[PDB]
């Protein structure tokens, strides 16, 4: 009955599949175009739902056609959005994406602004006993640090079988987000963050960044087509190769698929080695199809 909660961003992705990258100053038909619910935390809710886990999303929405599409899509997947922060006004962000079918490239034109992120005041109203796992996409670090501290104070009063497991994603190389390294039992660190901090390989990143994580936590670093690596308190450097499809056609959300699949596998009691393998398997399969529905 307990759900998995993901806190972070939801956007509307308008995805244009093309057979060649558009030439500036021209008009040309795409191969296909679709509206797709996006955002890191939102995409991980999609994959968790497809994998069979009841999950909830916490993010910001503003009234309009965009939010109406997103709410209906959330409902279709069975993702709980009762804790979404509804802003009085604003523009729900929309990403225009160009997916080149010929070379597998992914180009994202991101919205110029975002709605205000979920506040710690917002998060304080959440009944934490509803959830066995809470994943936070690193965005507004000062507010999210307070959220993570609230979960720690909650867990201090709970016995072992009723503690809420926590994971965080640190994807953008913004110094403020690095306060999140010291929270959660699993920390997903992006390749962009690793390179920004001076590491040019997943193995180097784990060795160099492990001192930042909380006592007993596991650091996870996915490295695109090179697979994914992890380092936990037992001191073993773990690695899974990627599972590339015969033809890479859609990598948008592949990292979100990896994140959700690792969470799913760990929530079912699997080892980090198996969860890393499972995450690359599901994410690699996703890269060979459009959207997420085909991962099954």
Ligand X SMILES: OC[C@H]1O[C@](O)(CO)[C@@H](O)[C@@H]1O
Binding site for ligand X (CB under 6 A): 11, 13, 38-40, 43, 95, 108, 110, 252-253, 255-256
Identity of the residue, 108 or 197, whose beta carbon is nearer to ligand X in the bound complex: 108
**Range 71-100, binding a copy of itself (CB under 8 A):** 94, 96, 98, 100
> How far apart are the C-alpha atoms of 66 and 93, rounded to whole Å?
8
Q: Select from a copy of itself, ligand ADP, ligand X, none the partner in contact with residue 282, using the beta carbon and a kind-dependent cut-off of 5 to 8 Å.
A: none
> How far apart are the C-alpha atoms of 143 and 102, rounded to whole Å?
42
Identity of the residue, 31 or 110, whose beta carbon is nearer to ligand X in the bound complex: 110
**Range 232-291, binding ligand ADP (CB under 6 A):** 242, 244, 248, 251, 254-255, 258, 280, 283-284, 287
CB burial of 72-87 (b: ≥16 within 10 Å; e: otherwise) equals: ebbeebebbbebbbee
- State the virtual CA torsion across 9, 10, 16, 19 in degrees, nearest 10: 40
> How far apart are the C-alpha atoms of 47 and 288, rounded to whole Å?
15
Identity of the residue, 43 or 83, whose beta carbon is nearer to ligand X in the bound complex: 43
**x-or-dash string of contact with ligand ADP, 179-218, rule CB under 6 A:** ------------x---------------------------
Residue 44 CB, shortest distance to ligand X, in Å, is 9
Taking a C-beta distance cutoff of 8 angstroms, is the pair 285, 267 a contact? no
Q: Select from ligand X, ligand ADP, a copy of itself, none the partner in contact with residue 11, using the beta carbon and a kind-dependent cut-off of 5 to 8 Å.
A: ligand X
Taking a C-beta distance cutoff of 8 angstroms, is the pair 280, 240 a contact? yes
């Amino acid at each position: 009955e307990k759900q998995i909660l993901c806190v972070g961003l939801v956007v509307l992705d308008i995805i244009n599949v093309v057979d060649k990258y558009p030439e500036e100053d021209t008009d040309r038909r795409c191969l296909s175009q679709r509206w797709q619910r996006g955002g890191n935390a939102s995409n991980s809710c999609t994959v968790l739902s497809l994998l069979g886990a009841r999950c909830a999303f916490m993010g910001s929405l503003a009234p309009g056609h965009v939010a109406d599409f997103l709410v209906a899509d959330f409902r279709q997947r069975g993702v709980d959005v009762s804790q979404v922060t509804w802003q009085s006004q604003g523009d729900t962000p929309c990403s225009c994406c160009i997916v080149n079918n010929s070379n597998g490239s992914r180009t994202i034109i991101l919205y110029d602004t975002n709605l205000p992120d979920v506040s710690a005041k917002d998060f304080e109203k959440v009944d934490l006993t509803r959830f066995k796992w809470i994943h936070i996409e690193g965005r507004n670090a000062s507010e999210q640090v307070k959220m993570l501290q609230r979960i720690e104070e909650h867990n201090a009063k709970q016995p072992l079988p009723q503690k809420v497991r926590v994971s965080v994603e640190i994807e953008k190389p913004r110094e403020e987000l690095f306060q999140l390294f010291s929270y959660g039992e699993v920390v997903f660190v992006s390749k962009d963050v690793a390179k920004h901090l001076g590491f040019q390989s997943a193995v180097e990143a784990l060795r160099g960044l492990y001192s930042r994580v909380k006592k007993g936590a596991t650091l996870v670093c996915a490295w695109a087509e090179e697979g994914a690596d992890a380092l936990g308190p037992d001191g073993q450097l773990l690695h899974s190769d990627a599972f590339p499809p015969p033809r890479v056609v859609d990598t948008l959300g592949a990292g979100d698929t990896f994140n959700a699949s690792v969470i799913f596998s760990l929530s079912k009691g699997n080892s980090m080695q198996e969860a890393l393998r499972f995450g690359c398997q599901v994410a690699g399969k996703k890269c060979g199809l459009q959207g997420f529905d085909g991962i099954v």
